[PDB]
């Protein structure tokens, strides 16, 4: 009953989010955005692999959910349930409209045509750009050959062209591998639930020494 994705592939309209002017949308089909060992620490999974778009288009929420399930199922079966942390770095906020016309015989007798053609919400999509990351998965270096295959399998569920890029960053951080290594050999890193907080030269020295005491123990 749903239209094909080629009717809403391209960013033709302005962003149309759910707000106090919509008030009646269908909820998104994709609900889980982080999966795998999402509670893993930062230095557990150094390697980060991105499935990144090469088109300026719209990815449907159904396609996102399907690609998520595909990559999750494949990597959990042939690499273990807790060997990766996958994160979907897009969120479907664009609301797709449909002007539903009657499909019966003699529908023109009661259709009114293009008069009052403003559509009704029937879908949800995420507007992506050139070089916008869709999926990001962090693992150890022993999992690269299979997370590449998982993202390659998930790529079939998306329209357009996507590239699989091995990032030079340590996991889901913004630091390179040796920069993070020389930062973590000293005590200026301090782990969080899944991410890590860093020491800055700014701020109160009392709290800076209360945290990160190993860096100050010089």
């Amino acid at each position: 009953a749903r239209r094909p994705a080629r009717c809403y592939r391209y960013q033709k309209n302005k962003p149309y989010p759910k707000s106090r002017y919509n008030r009646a949308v269908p909820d998104s089909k994709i609900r889980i955005y982080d999966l795998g060992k999402k509670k893993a620490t930062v230095d557990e999974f150094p390697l980060c692999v991105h499935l990144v778009s090469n088109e300026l288009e719209q990815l449907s929420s159904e396609a996102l959910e399907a690609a998520r399930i595909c990559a999750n199922k494949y990597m959990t079966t042939v690499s273990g349930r807790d060997a990766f942390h996958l994160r979907v770095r897009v969120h479907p906020f664009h609301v797709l409209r449909i002007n539903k016309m009657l499909s019966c015989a003699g529908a023109d007798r009661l259709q009114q045509g293009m008069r009052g053609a403003w559509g009704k919400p029937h879908g949800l999509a995420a507007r992506v750009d050139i070089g916008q990351i869709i999926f990001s998965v962090r693992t150890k270096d022993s999992n690269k050959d299979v997370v590449v295959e998982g993202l390659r399998r998930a790529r079939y569920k998306f329209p357009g062209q996507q590239k699989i890029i091995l990032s030079k960053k340590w996991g889901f951080t913004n630091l390179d591998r040796p920069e993070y290594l020389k930062k973590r050999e000293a005590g200026e890193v301090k782990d969080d639930g899944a991410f890590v907080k860093f020491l800055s030269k700014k701020g109160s020295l009392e709290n800076n020494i209360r945290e990160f005491p190993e860096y100050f123990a010089a």
Partner: protein, 159 residues
């Protein structure tokens, strides 16, 4: 239906600003306007009386009338195929002096000083402004400035 009120589409135009809300400072009331001054129009949302219409925001005009708390300004409005003169009575909170006019007056008195000085010597003042002329010759040396060779860089992801 359609809506074209006196303050249509004035939402951001008549907003005050970030962090200078409240009352207006006293220099706006202490400034003195004379007939023939050149003033810019910028409406103040805090003062609802004597506001200009949205067309005249950022317009520059000439004072023709001075009242108790307001100023008469003459604007040239483009209507159809010609300009019309429009007389506006605006409170002085929406009005500031044009800086270009006074900077021209300083240029006038500077040119007067130059002419009055060099009339005693006859040295051909050349009081007109001139555009940015093309730069003339020069000899640049390499002592401590040996040229450093550059090359285009290869492609890299940088993510």
């Amino acid at each position: 239906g359609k809506s074209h009120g006196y303050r249509s589409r004035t939402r951001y135009m008549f907003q005050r600003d970030f962090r200078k809300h409240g009352a207006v400072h006293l220099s706006t009331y202490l400034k003195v306007y004379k007939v023939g001054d050149i003033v810019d129009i910028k409406a103040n949302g805090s003062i609802q009386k004597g506001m200009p219409h949205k067309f005249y925001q950022g317009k520059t005009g000439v004072v023709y009338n001075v009242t108790k708390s307001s100023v008469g300004v003459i604007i040239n409005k483009m209507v159809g195929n010609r300009y019309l003169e429009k007389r506006l009575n605006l409170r002085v909170e929406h009005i500031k002096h044009s800086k270009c006019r006074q900077e021209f007056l300083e240029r006038v008195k500077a040119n007067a000083a130059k002419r009055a000085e060099a009339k005693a010597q006859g040295v051909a003042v050349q009081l007109k402004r001139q555009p940015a002329q093309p730069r003339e010759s020069r000899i640049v040396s390499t002592e401590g400035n040996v040229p450093q060779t550059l090359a285009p860089v290869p492609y890299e992801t940088f993510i």
